[PDB]
Curated annotation (Swiss-Prot):
High-level lineage: Eukaryota, Metazoa, Chordata, Craniata, Vertebrata
List of catalytic residues: 154 (proton acceptor)
Naturally occurring in which organism (per UniProt): Homo sapiens (Human)
Protein name, per record: Casein kinase II subunit alpha
The family this protein is said to belong to: Belongs to the protein kinase superfamily. Ser/Thr protein kinase family. CK2 subfamily.
Keyword set, alphabetical order: Apoptosis, ATP-binding, Biological rhythms, Cell cycle, Disease variant, Intellectual disability, Kinase, Nucleotide-binding, Nucleus, Phosphoprotein, Serine/threonine-protein kinase, Transcription, Transcription regulation, Transferase, Wnt signaling pathway
Gene transcribed to yield this protein: CSNK2A1
Amino acid sequence: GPVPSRARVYTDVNTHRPSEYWDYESHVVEWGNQDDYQLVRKLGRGKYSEVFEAINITNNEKVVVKILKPVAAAKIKREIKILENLRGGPNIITLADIVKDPVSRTPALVFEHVNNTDFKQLYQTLTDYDIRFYMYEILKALDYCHSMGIMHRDVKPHNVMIDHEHRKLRLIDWGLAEFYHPGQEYNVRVASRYFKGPELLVDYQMYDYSLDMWSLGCMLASMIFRKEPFFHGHDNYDQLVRIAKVLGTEDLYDYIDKYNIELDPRFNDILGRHSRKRWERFVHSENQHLVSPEALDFLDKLLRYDHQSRLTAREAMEHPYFYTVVK
Ligand SMILES: COc1ccc(C(F)(F)F)cc1-c1ccc(CN)cc1Cl
């Protein structure tokens, strides 16, 4: 069968911490008062929740209320526990309260308010300097949650709120986050298609924090090359083929051979043979202002098939790409 794998970092964090830390099922939720909050406007709705701008009428502060849907309701303890464990961490969204929505009869998570700049404005106007600055801010959040034994598993632009006016960033939506336990087999049906790591696409279940580093690399590649999304698969199978047209099929075969993974035979009719492409191939006059030898070298070290070979968040923070960023 497949060869087991374990993270090269933070392998023991959930061992060194008491069971109360990671055993979310045993966690008792201390409910607040739903009447403290007045809903102002609906901000959006996803697969698992409906998000609203609200006012905490007790202290007159702006908040965000996330009313979980019934499907999300079963796994709320995991999200709550993770949010409470990470509260106060750098660039981690702050959970302010947990109440029971009167109408939905489900839990509603109350967060600090962040004024998020629209995607278009950020995607189209962030400078090379801003990209390095915000990438470093995301790395602070990822090294914090990884060091705390948690993998986000849904790193993508929709889950990164940026208040550009105040140069403030928060990593949000911890609904898909999990505690990392060495040897544990995890559901591969996590992350949005374009951000899914090769481990998910080849059905390798014993993955870890490094999945977040692949997703981060996908966001960086799209941003610096002006190619949104970078790996534009039509489905989960074509997703791996799009990756292979860049990274090459030889390193993909070395990866699955290392972990004794068998590719799904449906790949025989679509994968083909592809050489590894040099990152300079994606450079052109419309993205040259965002590219540098340091950016390409950084990207190269995140976007690797072998989840054990990618830079960790802490190593990534040491990279020359961030030398220009004011610390
Ligand atoms: C492809 O998206 C990104 C890619 C890289 C970066 C960063 F390098 F600056 F950190 C930010 C975004 C982004 C992150 C979040 C949003 C809006 N929620 C918008 C954008 Cl453009």
